[PDB]
RNA sequence: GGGACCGAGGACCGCGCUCUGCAAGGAUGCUGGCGUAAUGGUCACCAGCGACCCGUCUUGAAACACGGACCAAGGAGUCAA
RNA sequence: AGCGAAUGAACUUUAAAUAUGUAAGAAGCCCUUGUUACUUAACUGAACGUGGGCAUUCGAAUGUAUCGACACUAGUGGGCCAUUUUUGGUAAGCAGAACUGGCGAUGCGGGAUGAACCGAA
């Protein structure tokens, strides 16, 4: 009888996708990356970047 | 699961009897065996699965 | 529920795979060319006159 | 995701029915393995084997005029400062404006 | 024009059996966004070599930014612009903080002084003048003149545009 | 050349012989023959109306008409499909019978070793 | 967080959820003044904006030309083979 | 583009832009042998048939607010403007074909105004 927007109505969102509760509770939209030291950019890359 | 991707099937009433049909549908989708209107090729997926199992692409022991 | 959880996992894994492939190519000194996009949204915003 | 969730209408027996139920998604696309809105979104975004059927089932999304205007001269190509053509990743911003 | 950034593009002819591992052409350009950058790269490559968009691909597009956007630099731009008579060369100088700002000012100045447009202007070579004695234009010379200090006479005060009526006559001294 | 009835024929229109000169609209067209005479051949062609399409009949002699190979491509595709499906049935593996519309390219890496990119100015000065 | 417009239906069923219940297949609860020209509607005028005099005829179209002082009654595809 | 490939728009390994005709399956191809008054030196070819082969991706995409056949019935047979292509000519005008687009029977926003403009029914 009405089309309720699931992006505004949490209940329609839960009805359509039961994983919304787990998404919100586990903060799957705020997942950090791995914890490793990133290697430096190569000097060849820097020289090609500023070749001209 | 890892070797065939195949998102988990719906178990439905009972176990296995229709889980095999869902496995056939998912394997057909993953391999690319479809129909005229996009109907999944369950029997071609089954044939591919049994051929791969005979060739040894699937592990298993007693 | 299970299918949606694995869909979310697959989306995140694909994003990280793209990022990691670009970074490893950059580190090895090559250039990684991403696969061309397979999906297009098209909007008809112009009238039908002439 | 937002195009399916907010403006998603299916062609059920030639009628524009809002996608309010995983059930109706299942009757219309169950023989393809698509049984929920998440499955439809997956099949559309990750272009799957049955993308043709999923897109045909989806009624063409009726968008509104963008919130914020198009551009001062919208009838030339996007690569000369217009709006027409292939805006590669900027159509996401256009969809934000048009929703 | 617009807001610009450095875009360095490598693109190559699509590999074939006849000539695998092609030349991998590269060039740096100024575009408001990556789509325009790739379009301009392909247009320039079509103009120079016999490589087209269909028979080519974009290996890489990266944003070159300034090494030091906080120190004042003098830039010399050699450009070619086509007017009703033909193609003409100009060397012009700009005192900015970035090559992006130099190119922005150059488009603005060419439009103001010669009515030359984006597709009528070609950027052939933009360089940073490593030291004085490399500046040839009197305006930037007077800008780099020793112990440069000047007043700002007749400074019109910044009054709100909704302040229709004032009670005192404004002053233009400070 | 020997031409029978029912085949598909291309018209070239050369300037060697002025007899039986066809129009420029009929120049460089393709059609199916319906009448065969001693020298001229009756060809049915599709003409474009200002809003529709119609069928017209013309008489073009031997010096302009030649057989085509569109049906040759169709028939060779049929033969290839039959042979490939028989081989697939023999080997117990599935094969793609249809032809694909040439999907986009995938991701790959291009090395820079001994292939240093060359910088190109917008116009070449030498 | 603030604002605007809207409230279609009329026992229950259905999808659901955070399940003593609920924002879950369309508005209920509380309170005030008035209970009459108060709301509302119709005429006359003013104000803001909009707005060529109808029909016929010709032509691709206009323009031209023709008919129109006003009102009442009558007034033109019917019957037979 | 090259002629550090040959030869010399009329040269070519390759090949632009630009519109454009035909065909894309059971409404199928073959292969195999029975007949025929056709034909051939001949059971030899052609036609008429049998058997097989794929019903599941049955042989590209995308759309599909159904398509085809027969019968009967009313109003229509004018053109004007413009883009692109093209033939001819003048001092300049301009004239003629082809496609497509606006007007008819079309109201609305803009261009102060307005058949031929822009947006949009």
d(C-alpha E15, C-alpha D95), whole Å: 36
Judged by CB atoms closer than 8 Å, whether chains meet at E57 and C33 is answered as yes
E57 touches chain C (CB under 8 A): yes
E168 with E124: CB under 8 angstroms? Answer: no
- 3-class SS of residue D53: helix
Contacts of E46 (CB under 8 A, 6+ apart): E52, E53
d(C-alpha E153, C-alpha D50), whole Å: 73
For residue B23, the tally of other CB atoms under 10 A from its CB is 18
d(C-alpha E33, C-alpha E41), whole Å: 12
Q: Please give the full DSSP string across C2-31, using - where no structure is assigned.
A: HHHHHHHHHHHHHHHHHHHHHHHHHHHT-E
Sheet with F118-119: list strands edge to edge: E56-64, E5-13, E25-31, F118-119
Contacts of A32 (CB under 8 A, 6+ apart): none
CA dihedral C24, C29, C30, C34 (to 10 degrees): 40
d(C-alpha B35, C-alpha B58), whole Å: 26
Residues β-bridged to residue A25: none
Minimal C-alpha gap between C4 and chain D (Å): 6
Minimal C-alpha gap between B8 and chain C (Å): 6
Residues β-bridged to residue F33: F43
E91 with E102: CB under 8 angstroms? Answer: no
Nucleotides of H under 7 A from a protein CB: 1, 16, 20-25, 28-30, 53-54, 56-65, 98-102, 118-121
Beta-sheet pairing, E25-31 with E73-83: unpaired
C46 with D85: CB under 8 angstroms? Answer: no
- 3-class SS of residue B60: coil
Q: What backbone phi and psi angles, to 5 degrees, belong to A48?
A: -65, -35
- CA distance readout (Å), E72 to E69, E94, E131, E148, E164: 8, 11, 12, 14, 40
C33 touches chain E (CB under 8 A): yes
Q: Which two tokens stand for residue E153?
A: 């006479």
Handedness of CA B17, B21, B24, B25 (dihedral sign): negative
Q: How far is CA F98 from the centre of its chain?
A: 19
Q: Which DSSP category does F3 fall into?
A: -
Minimal C-alpha gap between A16 and chain F (Å): 33
Q: Which two tokens stand for residue F112?
A: 């820079």
CA dihedral E101, E106, E107, E113 (to 10 degrees): 140
G57 C1' to D56 CA distance, Å: 56
Q: What backbone phi and psi angles, to 5 degrees, belong to E83?
A: -110, -175
Judged by CB atoms closer than 8 Å, whether chains meet at F112 and A44 is answered as yes
d(C-alpha E8, C-alpha E29), whole Å: 6
d(C-alpha F94, C-alpha F92), whole Å: 7
d(C-alpha D21, C-alpha D35), whole Å: 10
H78 C1' to E20 CA distance, Å: 66
- 3-class SS of residue E36: helix
Question: Nearest residue to H28, CA vs C1'?
Answer: F78
For residue E30, the tally of other CB atoms under 10 A from its CB is 23
d(C-alpha D23, C-alpha D1), whole Å: 18
Q: Which DSSP category does D58 fall into?
A: B
Exp. method: cryo-EM
Helix (H) or strand (E) holding E101, with range, is helix E99-114
Q: Which among E26, E45, E47 is the nearest to F119, CB-wise?
A: E26
Q: Touching D: which chains, 3+ CB pairs < 8 A? A: A, B, C, E
Q: What backbone phi and psi angles, to 5 degrees, belong to D12?
A: -100, 110
d(C-alpha B16, C-alpha B14), whole Å: 7
Handedness of CA F95, F100, F102, F104 (dihedral sign): negative
Minimal C-alpha gap between B13 and chain F (Å): 32
Which nucleotide has the least CA–C1' distance to D21?
Answer: G15
d(C-alpha D91, C-alpha C43), whole Å: 9
Q: Which two tokens stand for residue C39?
A: 């999906």
| CB distance under 7 Å to strand G: residues | A 1-2, 4, 9-12, 14-15, 18, 21; D 21-23
Counting Cα atoms < 13 Å in the Cβ hemisphere of C38 gives 16
Q: Which DSSP category does F13 fall into?
A: -
| Helical residues (DSSP H) of chain F, grouped into ranges | 70-91
d(C-alpha D37, C-alpha D21), whole Å: 8
Length of chain D: 99
E15 with E21: CB under 8 angstroms? Answer: yes
Residues β-bridged to residue E79: E90, E123
d(C-alpha A50, C-alpha F117), whole Å: 13
Which nucleotide has the least CA–C1' distance to B31?
Answer: H57
Shortest CA distance to F21 belongs to which of F63, F49, F82?
F63
Q: Touching B: which chains, 3+ CB pairs < 8 A? A: C, D, F
G70 C1' to E27 CA distance, Å: 89
- 3-class SS of residue C48: coil
d(C-alpha E105, C-alpha E128), whole Å: 15
d(C-alpha B62, C-alpha B32), whole Å: 32
d(C-alpha E24, C-alpha E9), whole Å: 10
Q: CB of residue F88 closer than 7 A to nucleic acid strand H?
A: no
Q: Which two tokens stand for residue F26?
A: 């009929």
Shortest CA distance to C8 belongs to which of A29, D36, D30?
A29
Cβ contacts of E127-135, under 8 Å, gap ≥ 24? E127/E75, E127/E76, E127/E77, E128/E73, E128/E74, E128/E75, E128/E99, E129/E73, E129/E74, E129/E75, E129/E76, E129/E93, E134/E74, E134/E76, E135/E74, E135/E93
Shortest CA distance to F116 belongs to which of E37, A41, A42, E10?
E10
Q: Please list every residue in chain F whose beta carbon sits closer than 8 Å to the beta carbon of residue E21.
A: 115
d(C-alpha D43, C-alpha D56), whole Å: 12
Length of chain B: 62
- CA distance readout (Å), E143 to E40, E94, E101, E147: 35, 11, 17, 10
Contacts of F40 (CB under 8 A, 6+ apart): F20, F59, F60, F61
Helix (H) or strand (E) holding E125, with range, is strand E121-128
Which nucleotide has the least CA–C1' distance to C1?
Answer: G16
Query: To one decimal place, what's the resolution in Å?
Result: 3.1
Q: Which DSSP category does F63 fall into?
A: G
Nucleotides of G under 7 A from a protein CB: 8, 15-18, 22-26
H105 C1' to C49 CA distance, Å: 18
- 3-class SS of residue C33: strand
d(C-alpha F43, C-alpha F9), whole Å: 8
E53 with E42: CB under 8 angstroms? Answer: yes
C46 with D75: CB under 8 angstroms? Answer: yes
Burial (CB < 10 A; 0-12, 13-18, 19+), residue E86, is exposed
Q: Which of residues 2-31 of C touch A (CB under 8 A)?
A: 4-5, 8, 12, 16, 26-27, 29
d(C-alpha E69, C-alpha E98), whole Å: 6
For residue A31, the tally of other CB atoms under 10 A from its CB is 10
Shortest CA distance to C31 belongs to which of F110, F29, E8?
F110
């Amino acid at each position: 009888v009405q089309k309720k927007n699931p992006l505004r109505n949490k209940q329609i969102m839960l009805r359509l996708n039961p994983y919304a509760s787990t998404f919100a509770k586990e903060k799957l939209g705020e997942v950090k990356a791995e914890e490793g030291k990133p290697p430096k950019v190569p000097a060849s890359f820097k020289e090609l970047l500023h070749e001209a | 699961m890892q070797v065939y991707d195949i998102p988990p099937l719906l178990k439905d009433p009972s176990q296995g009897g229709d889980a095999t049909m869902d496995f056939l549908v998912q394997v057909a989708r993953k391999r690319g065996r479809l129909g005229r209107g996009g109907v999944p090729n369950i029997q071609a997926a089954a044939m591919t699965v049994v051929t791969d199992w005979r060739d040894g692409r699937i592990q298993g022991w007693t | 529920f299970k299918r949606a959880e694995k869909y979310v996992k697959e989306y995140r894994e694909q994003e990280r795979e793209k990022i990691r492939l670009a970074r490893i190519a950059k580190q090895q000194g090559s250039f990684h060319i991403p696969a061309e996009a397979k999906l297009v949204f098209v909007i008809r915003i112009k009238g039908i006159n002439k | 995701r937002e195009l399916i969730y907010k403006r998603g209408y299916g062609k059920v027996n030639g009628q524009r029915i809002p996608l309010t139920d995983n059930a109706i998604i299942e009757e219309n696309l169950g023989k393809y393995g698509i049984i929920c809105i998440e499955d439809l979104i997956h099949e559309i975004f990750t272009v799957g084997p049955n993308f043709k059927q999923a897109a045909n089932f989806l009624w063409p999304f009726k968008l509104s005029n963008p919130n914020g205007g198009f551009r001062p001269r919208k009838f030339k190509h996007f690569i000369e400062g217009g709006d027409l053509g292939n805006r590669e990743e900027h159509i996401n911003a256009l969809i934000r404006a048009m929703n | 024009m617009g807001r610009l950034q450095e875009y360095q593009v490598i693109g190559r002819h699509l590999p074939t059996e006849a000539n695998p591992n092609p030349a991998l052409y590269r060039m740096r350009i100024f575009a408001p966004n990556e789509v325009v950058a790739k379009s301009r790269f392909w247009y320039f490559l079509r103009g120079l070599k016999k490589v087209k968009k269909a028979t080519g691909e974009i290996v890489s597009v990266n944003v070159i930014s300034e090494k030091h956007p906080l120190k004042v630099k003098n830039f010399g731009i050699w450009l070619r612009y086509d007017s009703r008579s033909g193609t003409h060369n100009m060397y012009k100088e700009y005192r900015e903080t970035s090559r992006v700002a130099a190119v922005e000012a150059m488009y603005a100045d060419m439009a103001a002084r010669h009515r030359a447009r984006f597709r009528s202007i070609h950027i052939l070579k933009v360089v940073e003048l490593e030291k004085t004695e490399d500046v040839k234009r009197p305006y930037i010379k007077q800008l780099v003149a020793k112990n440069l200090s000047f007043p700002l006479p007749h400074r019109v005060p910044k009054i709100s545009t909704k302040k229709i009526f004032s009670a005192k006559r404004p002053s233009t001294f400070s | 050349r020997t031409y029978r009835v029912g085949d598909i024929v291309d018209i070239k229109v050369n300037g060697a012989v002025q007899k039986g000169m066809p129009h420029k609209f009929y120049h460089g067209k393709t059609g199916v023959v319906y009448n065969v005479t001693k020298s001229a051949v009756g060809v049915i062609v599709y003409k474009r109306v200002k809003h529709r399409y119609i069928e017209k009949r013309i008489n073009v002699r031997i010096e302009h008409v030649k057989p085509s190979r569109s049906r040759e491509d169709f028939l060779r595709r049929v033969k290839e499909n039959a042979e490939l499906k028989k081989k697939a049935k023999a080997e117990g593996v599935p094969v793609q019978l249809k032809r694909q519309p040439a999907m986009p390219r995938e991701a790959h890496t291009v090395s820079i070793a001994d292939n240093k990119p060359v910088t190109l100015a917008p116009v070449a000065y030498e």
